[PDB]
């Protein structure tokens, strides 16, 4: 449902290439004219070949064609809707009623579902259907899995925000270690689980588990092609730094942890800095 041909045309003309430079040794003129007209759908193989001819990145051409946004399909709309509802809760009930039953259709809907549960939990909205099903749900979705996709690591990241660690950990363990990268998004979610769990394990003083997560994150850094998140790398190192303060009780590591958090302020991540300062004070007591 995207005008790729129009973007090819756009780029081709911008680079002063002639139609011939593009279709020759790939398809007929009259056919390529139909691609730029966006009347004939284009193959991935074909687009890949055109990307080479122009010298413009394959994925960039896709973004320009309209894949960069999330509004491309139902699921994305719904995922953007989360923000709206988070800030404007009165819109919860109406939406949750539409989402809740669809939760086990695609891994994508399930992520959204967990999102709604988080909104509920935050504003003390009653969610009885949740506590009655999550277990059977996760057992449905995961009891027979072998490999894990970006969305799975997303789900689990979110799941950790609505279930006690002791219920989620059995699911996390099989999903690590990571051996390869499958995009910047896959990169994000695999990192998020680690970040989230390391947080929780420190909060709860499960230092043995907490180390596992630190070590897992370090391993990520060794993967070829993996796109480590800069802000994550900072947050996890703070948590690592706190781990070292809890285990070796040496005060230097605490200060490092503080100095890391501060750097967030110094680079204008104002609200993230606030959230961290609260969490550090919280750590130095309980959760």
């Amino acid at each position: 449902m995207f005008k790729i041909g129009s973007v090819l045309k756009q780029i081709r003309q911008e680079l002063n290439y002639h139609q011939i430079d593009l279709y020759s040794g790939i398809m007929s003129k009259s056919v390529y004219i139909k691609v730029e007209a966006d009347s004939r759908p284009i193959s991935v193989e074909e687009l890949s070949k055109f990307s080479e001819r122009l010298g413009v990145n394959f994925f960039e051409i896709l973004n320009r064609a309209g894949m960069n946004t999330k509004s491309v399909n139902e699921t994305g709309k719904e995922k953007l809707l989360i923000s709206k509802i988070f800030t404007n809760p009165d819109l919860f009930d109406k939406n949750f009623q539409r989402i809740e039953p669809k939760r086990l259709t695609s891994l994508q809907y399930f992520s959204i579902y967990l999102g709604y549960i988080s909104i509920a939990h935050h504003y003390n909205i009653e969610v009885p259907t949740f506590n009655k099903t999550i277990t059977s749900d996760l057992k449905h979705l995961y009891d027979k899995r072998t490999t894990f996709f970006g969305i799975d690591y997303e789900i689990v990241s979110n799941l950790l925000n609505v279930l006690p660690y002791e219920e989620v950990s059995s699911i996390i363990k099989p999903m690590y270690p990571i051996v390869d990268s499958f995009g910047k998004d896959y990169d994000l979610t695999i990192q998020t689980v680690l970040k989230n769990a390391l947080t929780i394990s420190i909060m709860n003083r499960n230092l043995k588990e907490a180390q596992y997560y630190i070590n897992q994150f370090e391993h990520l850094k060794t993967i070829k092609n993996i796109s480590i998140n800069g802000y994550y790398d900072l947050e996890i190192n703070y948590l690592k730094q706190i781990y070292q303060f809890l285990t070796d009780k040496n005060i230097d590591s605490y200060l490092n942890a503080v100095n890391i958090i501060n750097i967030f302020k110094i680079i204008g991540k104002e609200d993230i800095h606030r959230s961290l300062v609260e969490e550090l004070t919280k750590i130095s007591a309980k959760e």
């Binding site: 995922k79 989360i82 992520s111 959204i112 999102g115 988080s118 970006g150 969305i151 997303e154 990241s157 979110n158 950790l160 925000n161 998004d185 994000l188 979610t189 998020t192 970040k195 989230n196 947080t199 929780i200 947050e235 993230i272 959230s275 961290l276 969490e279």
Partner: peptide
Amino acid sequence: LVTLVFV
């Protein structure tokens, strides 16, 4: 921090 993500 326990962050949520919706790719």
